[PDB]
Structure formats: C-alpha cells, structure tokens
C-alpha cells in the first residue's frame, strides 16, 4: 500500500503609490523568477 500528497501556495502582493500609470503597472507585474522586481522596471517606476 502506498500514499502520497503535495501542497503548494504562493501569494504575492506588490502595492504602489506614485508612479506614471504605465510604469506602475510595469513594476507591479509580479515576476515568479524575481519577486522583488526587475531592476530596470523598478528604476523606471522610480523615475515616473
């Protein structure tokens, strides 16, 4: 007799105030491969 089980959850929740409307939706688009933010998009948000 054999039994096996798995579970996974991910939640991620970027929130932004200030920024240009497009740069905001750029930065806040969550990267599974880089959950903090793509550095160029983040720098562009920090410009906008």
Partner 1 sequence: VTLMPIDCELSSWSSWTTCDPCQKKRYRYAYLLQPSQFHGEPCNFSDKEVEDCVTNRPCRSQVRCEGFVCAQTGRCVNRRLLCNGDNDCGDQSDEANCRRIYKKCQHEMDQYWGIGSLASGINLFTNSFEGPVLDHRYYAGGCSPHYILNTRFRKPYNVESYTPQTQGKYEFILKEYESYSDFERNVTEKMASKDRGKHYIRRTKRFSHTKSVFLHARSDLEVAHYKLKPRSLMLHYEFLQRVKRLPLEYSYGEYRDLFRDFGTHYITEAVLGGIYEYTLVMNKEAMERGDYTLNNVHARGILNEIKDRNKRDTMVEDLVVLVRGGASEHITTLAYQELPTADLMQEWGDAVQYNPAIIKVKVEPLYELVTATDFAYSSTVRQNMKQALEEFQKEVSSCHCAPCQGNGVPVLKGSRCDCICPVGSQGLACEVSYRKNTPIDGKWNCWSNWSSCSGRRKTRQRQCNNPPPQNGGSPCSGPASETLDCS
Partner 2 sequence: LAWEKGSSGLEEKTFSEWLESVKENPAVIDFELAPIVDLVRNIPCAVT
Q: Which parts of this chain interact with partner 1 (CB under 8 A)?
A: 1-26, 28-30, 32, 38, 41
Q: Are 13 and 42 in contact (CB under 8 A)?
A: no
Cβ nearer to partner 1, comparing 30 with 46: 30
The radius of gyration of the chain's CA atoms, rounded to the nearest angstrom, is 17
Q: Considering CB distances under 5 to 8 angstroms, the limit depending on partner class, which of partner 2, partner 1, none binds residue 47?
A: none
Cβ nearer to partner 1, comparing 5 with 43: 5
Q: Are 40 and 23 in contact (CB under 8 A)?
A: no
Q: Considering CB distances under 5 to 8 angstroms, the limit depending on partner class, which of partner 2, partner 1, none binds residue 28?
A: partner 1
């Amino acid at each position: 007799a054999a039994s096996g089980t798995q579970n996974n959850v991910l939640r991620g929740e970027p929130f932004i105030r200030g920024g240009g409307a497009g740069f905001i939706s750029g930065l806040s688009y969550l990267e599974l491969d880089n959950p903090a933010g793509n550095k160029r998009r983040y720098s562009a948000w920090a410009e906008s």
